[PDB]
Structure 1
Amino acid sequence: GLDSHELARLHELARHSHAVITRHQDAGGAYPAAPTFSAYRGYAWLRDGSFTAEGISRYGDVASAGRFHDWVDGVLRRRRGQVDDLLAAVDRGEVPSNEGMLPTRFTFDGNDGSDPWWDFQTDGYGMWLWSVVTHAARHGLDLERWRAGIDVAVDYLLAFWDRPCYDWWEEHVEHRHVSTLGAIHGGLVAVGTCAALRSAPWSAATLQVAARIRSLVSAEGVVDGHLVKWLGSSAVDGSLPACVVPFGLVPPDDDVAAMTRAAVAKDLDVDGGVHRFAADVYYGGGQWILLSALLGWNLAAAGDTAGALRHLRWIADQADADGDLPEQVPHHLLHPGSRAEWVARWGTVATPLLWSHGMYLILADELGLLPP
């Protein structure tokens, strides 16, 4: 395993991961993406926030995780009318524009941070359902605290799960991304198998739609035995292992899960650093801490502890002076010529990225390395 040299370093990084996340949590409950990055600062994402919240929940700060769930819940209850209006529009056969849909960026006071025309995404609503159910399960909490917000997210996802949207990386609005479908699946299966939610009017519908997502991924999201980045594609994306653990399109032991871990490792993993996708020119297409953590998590879940440890150590070696984890590092770049213009425009890469720290805490936890 680890000598006390490593255990010591990994424990201290976990404590710092907790402190970074909780210190930068907004007064209202939102977890920001990155407090100091020009392009992300002042905004919260349900995707970043939900993995961040799961990290914090595993670590055991019930107060912080709860305040984040309270924030999301209240933001969604305020969208009850917008979501009812969208559904009624569908019922009249008037397919609403991407511009009228629920946002991707939120302000800390729960307003659209951006025009959904430019960044329409559905994965975050699915991740939040997964996050809040998993938190309530872990800590014996009453989901009625967050139920009215869960109802908004479920109603929204049951109507719009099969709609093309931008991927986690804000690309290709015309496609249906297997890690977006995966995130929605994980959320629907979480609420649909939750005994506290057995009487919800949407209970059985969540499992029927989760089955329709799995049908669509079987038909168009599997090539040469592995998942693909979007329906009708041959290529992989670094997010795909999330479709095994924790979103559960397939379990860890499934041959598609094995083939997907192997395809991601072969195509996108360089010396423990996982790239997003082959064409990625964002800061030259560097190695993403959260993707190394995600692949590590999935190797742990599949019984490959060694594989998991190698990725955790890789992540730990990217911690800076203060123990802050960046979004990505440039040790290997897919398109090195593109880096300078990004640094020039937006500054040095987001550091800390709270999602980097949340994924650190999850992988540490999967390996039994949180401080005791």
Structure 2
Amino acid sequence: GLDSHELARLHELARHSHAVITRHQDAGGAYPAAPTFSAFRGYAWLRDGSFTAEGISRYGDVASAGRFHDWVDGVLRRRRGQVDDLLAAVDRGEVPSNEGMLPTRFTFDGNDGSDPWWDFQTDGYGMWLWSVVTHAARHGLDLERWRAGIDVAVDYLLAFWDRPCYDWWEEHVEHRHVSTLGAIHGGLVAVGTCAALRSAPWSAATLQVAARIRSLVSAEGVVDGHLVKWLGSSAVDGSLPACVVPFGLVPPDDDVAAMTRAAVAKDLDVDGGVHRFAADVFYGGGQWILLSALLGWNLAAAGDTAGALRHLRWIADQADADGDLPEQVPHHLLHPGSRAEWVARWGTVATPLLWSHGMYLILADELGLLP
């Protein structure tokens, strides 16, 4: 379904995506979120990094992806005692405050880059488990290389999966977000169904907790046949298709998958560019490359190759003269009056966003289009 013109361009954007991710990978293995964006420079996220790593793993750069997993593993093993102390606190009936939880932003040397009171999130730990397992399976690697870090993440998530936290977008700490729950589920199912991990002490528990997550989403996270943004809401969020592919709450052909893809398309997808959520005012609420890629990935997995391609083409159209993909573009803005103050404060939109490139690689690969 692509002509030679399109193929050449999409192949080039794939090569460039690989190049810009690997060129900016830190010496210690972390993937930065956005090396030139003021507010993000110097920091790594497990969310961004895990999707980036999956794109790189699909592309076939085993070395680069492995260095990312090395980095994350080492960062997590260093938190073994912090996690053990959090668990001991819970066992004494002294539930830790958000301020004591594991961080969202990491520095490249593995320290807290931000204060979790202000940005506590559990999704990234779930994404990392999904990513490392998927990588190891793809390339025939021994997970013992990263196991002790996996153990920290699993223990943490088994204890804290059901806690309110900020969403992927760093908002609404009091709620429980379906794409956060989904990310955790995906990680837990990945480890709980991995034969190499069959003897882990937590093996059965991971699948039981994943089932508990699905119970919670069934009870409070589905309305009118579609997933919703957070438990007890009616609205959708552009992150929700991740709950289908890759995180596996429901198969791609499930009615809830179909209805969720349709609700996201209707409420949030303008001309192929997917918004985060209706109330989004960040940079005026623009169209996010990674979310168009996520929707495209989900459409491909459901057999809607044409829909997947339309989203891939939209993303390619947002590459700048160097091939770099921004976080978002303003062709359609949900709240245009809010944009100028974000631009004043933080500068122009992050570009390249490594996660944008990682998602592009995933969707290109799903469509068989890597060079």
- Residue 179 of structure 1 and its aligned partner are, at CA, apart by 0.1
Distance 2:20 2:293 in 1: 17
Query: Aligned residue pairs: how many?
Result: 371
- Residue 210 of structure 1 and its aligned partner are, at CA, apart by 0.1
Residue of structure 2 in register with 1:92 after alignment: 92
Residue of structure 1 in register with 2:324 after alignment: 324
Q: Deviations over 1:125-162 (max 9, x none)?
A: 00000000000000000000000000000000000000
Distance 2:101 2:67 in 1: 25
- Residue 353 of structure 1 and its aligned partner are, at CA, apart by 0.1
Distance 1:175 1:103 in 2: 18
- Residue 29 of structure 1 and its aligned partner are, at CA, apart by 0.2
Distance 2:171 2:347 in 1: 21
Q: Deviations over 1:59-101 (max 9, x none)?
A: 0000000000000000000000000000000000101000000
Distance 2:311 2:133 in 1: 27
Distance 1:125 1:181 in 2: 11
Distance 2:101 2:343 in 1: 32
- Residue 217 of structure 1 and its aligned partner are, at CA, apart by 0.1
Q: Which secondary structure does the structure 2 equivalent of 1:210 belong to?
A: helix
- Residue 294 of structure 1 and its aligned partner are, at CA, apart by 0.1
Residue of structure 1 in register with 2:269 after alignment: 269
Identity %: 99
Distance 2:224 2:342 in 1: 35
Q: Deviations over 1:188-246 (max 9, x none)?
A: 00000000000000000000000000000000000000000000000000000000000
Q: Deviations over 1:87-128 (max 9, x none)?
A: 000000101000000000000000000010000000000000
Distance 1:115 1:345 in 2: 20
Q: Deviations over 1:170-192 (max 9, x none)?
A: 00000000000000000000000
Q: Which secondary structure does the structure 2 equivalent of 1:85 belong to?
A: helix
Q: Where does 1:1-372 land on structure 2 (aligned, <5 Å)?
A: 1-370=1-370, 372=371
Q: Which secondary structure does the structure 2 equivalent of 1:52 belong to?
A: helix
RMSD: 0.3
**Deviating 4+ runs (over 6 angstroms):** none
Distance 1:316 1:34 in 2: 19
- Residue 308 of structure 1 and its aligned partner are, at CA, apart by 0.1
Q: Which secondary structure does the structure 2 equivalent of 1:135 belong to?
A: helix
Unaligned runs of 5+ in 1: none
- Residue 14 of structure 1 and its aligned partner are, at CA, apart by 0.1
Q: Deviations over 1:337-369 (max 9, x none)?
A: 111111111000000000000000000000000
Unaligned runs of 5+ in 2: none
Distance 1:279 1:209 in 2: 31
Q: TM-score, length-normalised on structure 2?
A: 1.00
- Residue 167 of structure 1 and its aligned partner are, at CA, apart by 0.1
Distance 1:161 1:145 in 2: 25
